């Protein structure tokens, strides 16, 4: 999507593993505000819009 139309999509009732994001070997700036990335997969939160 574009920056004039980046939709607030509700993708619900799923899972999302981030260990395959951790070993993707292509990330430049991985910044997780509020909570640490090491405790991101085991504990989650609501309102998981992307």
């Amino acid at each position: 999507a574009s920056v004039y139309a980046w939709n607030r999509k509700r993708i619900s009732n799923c899972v999302a593993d981030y260990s395959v994001l951790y070993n993707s070997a292509s990330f430049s700036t991985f910044k997780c505000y509020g909570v640490s990335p090491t405790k991101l997969n085991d504990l989650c939160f609501t309102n998981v819009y992307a």
Partner: nanobody, 124 residues
Framework: QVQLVESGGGSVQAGGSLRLSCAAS????????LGWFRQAPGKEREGVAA????????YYADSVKGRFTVSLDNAKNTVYLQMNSLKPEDTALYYC??????????????????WGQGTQVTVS
């Protein structure tokens, strides 16, 4: 909560070898990312080396690519920086930084880092 004490500096002729270390004390498991900084005289402090503690992936700058390597020792909680094939443009102040928010390449001064006391590396 993260305290870094670094050592391993000194003077050597160009073409020699040196080895820096940066000992980490405190919340070791919260540290996710080790970055090595370098500030030349008359220049802004830039980034040289990078290390992810979880993955082990290394990132290097273009001026230090093929000559500089970084390694982690989890038993001593101390990151290592080995310098091979030194040139006299590397005379600068070196710093070690520990991150607890994730990994970001390239290194930037304005982000939150736990900063070391700094050491002098002089080559000629």
């Amino acid at each position: 909560q993260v305290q870094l004490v670094e050592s391993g500096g000194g003077s050597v002729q160009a073409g020699g070898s040196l080895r820096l270390s940066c000992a980490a004390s405190g919340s070791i498991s919260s540290i996710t990312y080790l970055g090595w900084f370098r500030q030349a005289p008359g220049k802004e402090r830039e980034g040289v080396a990078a290390l992810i503690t979880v993955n082990g992936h290394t990132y290097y700058a273009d001026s230090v690519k093929g000559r500089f390597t970084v390694s982690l020792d989890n038993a001593k909680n101390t990151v290592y920086l080995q310098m091979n094939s030194l040139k006299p443009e590397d005379t600068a102040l070196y710093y070690c930084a520990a991150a607890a928010w994730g990994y970001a390449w390239p290194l930037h001064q304005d982000d939150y880092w736990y900063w070391g006391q700094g050491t002098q590396v002089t080559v000629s």
